Amino acid sequence: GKRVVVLDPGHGGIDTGAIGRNGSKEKHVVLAIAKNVRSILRNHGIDARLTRSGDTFIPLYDRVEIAHKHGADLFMSIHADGFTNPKAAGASVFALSNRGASSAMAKYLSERENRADEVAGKKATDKDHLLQQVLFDLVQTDTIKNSLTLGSHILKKIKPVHKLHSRNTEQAAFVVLKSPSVPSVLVETSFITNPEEERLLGTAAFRQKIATAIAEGVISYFHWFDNQ
Ligand SMILES: [Zn+2]
């Protein structure tokens, strides 16, 4: 009865994700961080798997399908996305809300992240949107509660290491958080659009520090869960 954790490095292939002022691509940065997290979790006896181990495009639903196929106890998307103002900064963790965004920045990023599927030509029909809302509405309460707890465990560990954009786990209607049963969060490691954070994201030490904080968060979460 080993724990399975599925890590989704956001973007990939033709989807660069956000690009920093000095040209860094989210997709490369988050693959590096995701791999680091995997290693640490496996060193501690958790069966951690990637939705992609190379530079590949994956549709948002397929990322969640991979979590389901592997029987995940936990699913985590890792990003480093953008805002239109270079001054937005700090790390975030998000869980689902089907009712409405908890913050303006949650609402902004859920839209930006959810439109990643468009890079492949596939603009979302109304019928697609209806199916999303229905599916978000079906997510269990315990799932969302557990994702919020996971989220506060991760923020607790990031906080001593790097600026938080928000002290709480925020919520919005992220497609990759649509699993009814698997606790799911999306982690923003920084804003790549902030020049200082782009620079940090460009360093092995920072990527390692951030990945360490994320893995400690997961581990801390499993500890809490087992004590209940
Ligand atoms: Zn992203």
Residue numbers in the entry: 55 to 282
What does the paper say about this structure?
Crystals of AmiA diffract to a resolution of 2.4 Å and contain two molecules per asymmetric unit. The AmiA active site is composed of a single zinc atom that is held in place by two histidine residues (His65 and His133), an aspartate (Asp135), and two glutamates (Glu80 and Glu167). Similar to AmiB and AmiC, the AmiA active-site zinc is not accessible to peptidoglycan substrates due to the presence of an alpha helix that occludes the active site; we term this feature the “blocking helix” (red). As demonstrated in subsequent sections, the blocking helix has a role in autoinhibiting the activity of AmiA and forms part of a larger regulatory domain (residues 151–194) which includes a second alpha helix that constitutes the binding site for EnvC. We define the latter feature as the “interaction helix” (blue). The interaction helix is also notable for possessing five solvent-facing hydrophobic residues (Leu184, Leu185, Val188, Leu189, Leu192) and is the only feature for which we identify meaningful conformational differences between the two AmiA molecules observed in the crystal structure. In one chain, the interaction helix is well defined, while in the other, the corresponding electron density is smeared out, consistent with thermal motion. Both the experimental data and simulations consistently show that the regulatory domain is much more dynamic than the rest of the protein. The overall structure of AmiA is consistent with an autoinhibited form of the enzyme in which the active-site zinc is occluded by the blocking helix, while a potential protein interaction site remains exposed to solvent ready for activation.
Peptidoglycan amidases are key hydrolytic enzymes that are needed to break the peptidoglycan layer during cell division to allow for separation of daughter cells. In their resting states, zinc-dependent peptidoglycan amidases such as AmiB and AmiC adopt autoinhibited conformations in which their active sites are blocked by an alpha helix containing a conserved glutamate residue which binds to the active-site zinc. The activators share a common motif, the LytM domain, which forms the proposed site of amidase binding and activation.
